[PDB]
Every structure is written in C-alpha cells, then in structure tokens.
Amino acid sequence: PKSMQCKVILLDGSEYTCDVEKRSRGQVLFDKVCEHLNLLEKDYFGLTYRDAENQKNWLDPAKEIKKQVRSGAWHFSFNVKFYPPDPAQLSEDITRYYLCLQLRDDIVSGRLPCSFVTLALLGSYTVQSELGDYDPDECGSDYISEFRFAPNHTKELEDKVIELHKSHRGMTPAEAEMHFLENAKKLSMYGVDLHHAKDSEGVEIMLGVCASGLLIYRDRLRINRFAWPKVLKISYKRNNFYIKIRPGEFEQFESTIGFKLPNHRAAKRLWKVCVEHHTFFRLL
Ligand SMILES: CCNc1ccc(C#N)cn1
Numbered sequence: 199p200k201s202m203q204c205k206v207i208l209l210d211g212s213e214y215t216c217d218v219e220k221r222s223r224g225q226v227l228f229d230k231v232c233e234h235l236n237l238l239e240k241d242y243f244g245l246t247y248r249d250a251e252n253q254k255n256w257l258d259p260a261k262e263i264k265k266q267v268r269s270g271a272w273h274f275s276f277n278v279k280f281y282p283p284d285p286a287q288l289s290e291d292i293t294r295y296y297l298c299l300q301l302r303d304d305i306v307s308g309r310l311p312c313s314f315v316t317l318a319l320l321g322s323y324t325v326q327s328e329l330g331d332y333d334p335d336e337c338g339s340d341y342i343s344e345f346r347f348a349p350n351h352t353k354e355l356e357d358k359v360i361e362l363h364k365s366h367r368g369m370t371p372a373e374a375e376m377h378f379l380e381n382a383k384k385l386s387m388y389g390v391d392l393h394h395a396k397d398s399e400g401v402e403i404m405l406g407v408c409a410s411g412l413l414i415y416r417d418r419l420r421i422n423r424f425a426w427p428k429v430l431k432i433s434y435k436r437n438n439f440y441i442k443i444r445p446g447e448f449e450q451f452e453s454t455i456g457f458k459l460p461n462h463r464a465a466k467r468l469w470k471v472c473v474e475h476h477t478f479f480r481l482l
Pocket residue numbers: 246254255256277278391467468471
C-alpha cells in the first residue's frame with residue numbers, strides 16, 4: 199500500500215511530516231495534523247496548498263489529495279479557514295491559542311491592518327501569554343523583542359508593547375489569549391478573505407469573504423456588503439463570478455451582480471470559498 203510523504207507548516211512556523219496512502223482524501227491528512235496538535239474544535243481550520251499558478255487553495259477534505267496538488271509537491275500549511283466572530287464561545291483554550299497564532303501571522307504579513315496602539319496591545323498580550331509577568335532584568339531601555347508584532351517594527355512600538363506588558367501582571371496565558379482575541383475580532387479586516395476582481399464596468403475592486411457576508415471594496419468611501427441571508431445563489435462561468443441578491447420587500451425580481459476574475463480558476467476558488475462561508479455561517 200503506497201504512501202506519500204506530507205510536509206505541513208504549522209502555525210508556530212515548525213514543520214510536521216507524516217505519510218498517507220497516495221489515494222487518500224484530504225480529511226485523512228487533516229485528522230493526522232489535528233491529532234498532532236491536540237485540536238478537537240477542527241471545524242474552524244483546514245490545510246492550504248499552492249497550485250501550479252502559485253495560488254493558495256484550500257485542500258478539500260472530501261477529495262483525493264493527489265487530484266488537488268496534481269503536479270505539485272505534497273506541501274501544505276495549517277490555517278484558520280472560518281474565523282469565529284466571537285472567540286469567547288469556542289469551548290477550548292487550545293482552539294483560541296491556534297486562532298491567536300494565525301492572527302499574529304495575519305498581522306505580521308500585513309493581511310490584517312492594525313493601528314499602532316492595537317499592534318502594541320496585541321503584542322503585550324502575546325508577550326504576557328508566552329513569557330508571563332513583565333521582568334525588568336530581560337528588558338533595558340534598548341530592548342527589542344524576538345516576537346514579530348507588526349509588518350514594520352519601530353523602537354516606539356517595542357516601547358509601547360513593554361509599557362502595556364507591565365499592566366498585565368498576574369494574567370494567565372488563556373486569559374491573555376482571550377484578551378488578544380477580544381481586541382483582534384473588532385478589526386475591520388478580521389477574518390476577511392480578499393479576492394482581486396473587476397466589476398461589470400471593468401473597475402478594479404476587492405471582494406471580501408467573511409462571517410457577515412460578501413464585502414465589495416470599490417474606492418474606500420464606497421464599500422457594499424451582502425449579508426449571507428440576502429444571497430440565494432452563488433455561481434461562476436468562465437472568468438465570471440455571480441451572486442443572486444434576494445428581492446427586497448415588494449420587489450418583483452431577484453437582482454444579479456457580476457464580477458470579472460483574473461482567470462477561470464480564480465472564479466471557481468471565489469465561488470467555493472463563498473459557498474463554504476455561506477454554509478458555515480448559516481449553521482454556526
Ligand atoms: C491560509 C490561507 N489559505 C487560503 C486562503 C484563501 C483561499 C482561497 N480562495 C485558499 N486558501
């Protein structure tokens with residue numbers, strides 16, 4: 199029974215290696231990674247691979263791994279797929295821990311924009327969780343943390359992390375991670391999966407997929423939002439993505455909105471993440 203080696207980048211940046219039978223479905227690998235992680239609340243997470251166009255794809259747990267990675271290496275990342283709007287409602291502290299690690303990467307990468315003060319506050323909770331109580335012995339006037347807190351580090355940011363860290367004495371790691379999440383969950387781009395597209399006029403927009411629905415970012419001042427309940431059908435055809443927007447009260451007809459994606463695979467990927475978010479956040 200022939201087995202393929204799998205390499206998974208975990209959220210702490212380390213590498214997990216395991217073997218699965220070469221005809222395995224994605225769920226098989228996902229279950230192995232989740233067991234390694236002692237993760238029970240698995241519904242929020244998934245595995246990502248890079249396609250031949252170097253695009254991030256979700257590994258479909260129902261489909262064969264070989265029919266997804268195709269010509270590429272069996273290399274994956276472990277990621278948050280569905281960002282919970284209220285992390286306090288997760289049953290386990292370890293779930294909240296993996297969610298914090300994902301968000302720290304969302305912040306450092308610049309996917310999740312964040313004010314100076316919130317970067318410093320999130321940083322201070324991470325430091326409290328991981329080192330415990332502030333100690334002056336480790337931190338002089340010239341201290342720079344090993345921890346990555348932001349897309350661009352400044353001395354002023356390091357200083358503010360320490361000032362806030364001092365305020366958190368006696369805080370336990372679960373408590374500090376819960377405070378991290380209470381702040382992160384409020385950020386306007388929390389759990390927003392962005393897709394480059396063009397509107398029906400050819401104007402360049404971003405489509406955001408998240409818990410609260412589909413967001414259209416047009417020109418900073420013009421941001422349209424379609425709550426999942428207002429979306430009856432999600433479709434794609436060639437390079438085009440379509441949503442059916444339910445009739446308003448006393449309107450005779452459903453309204454259709456049309457977008458141009460860079461290519462046919464980008465249109466299918468956007469369709470599938472929308473359907474998955476619609477299902478997930480209809481049930482949650
Ligand atoms: C960890 C991020 N992984 C992702 C994100 C978006 C999509 C899509 N579409 C696939 N994988």
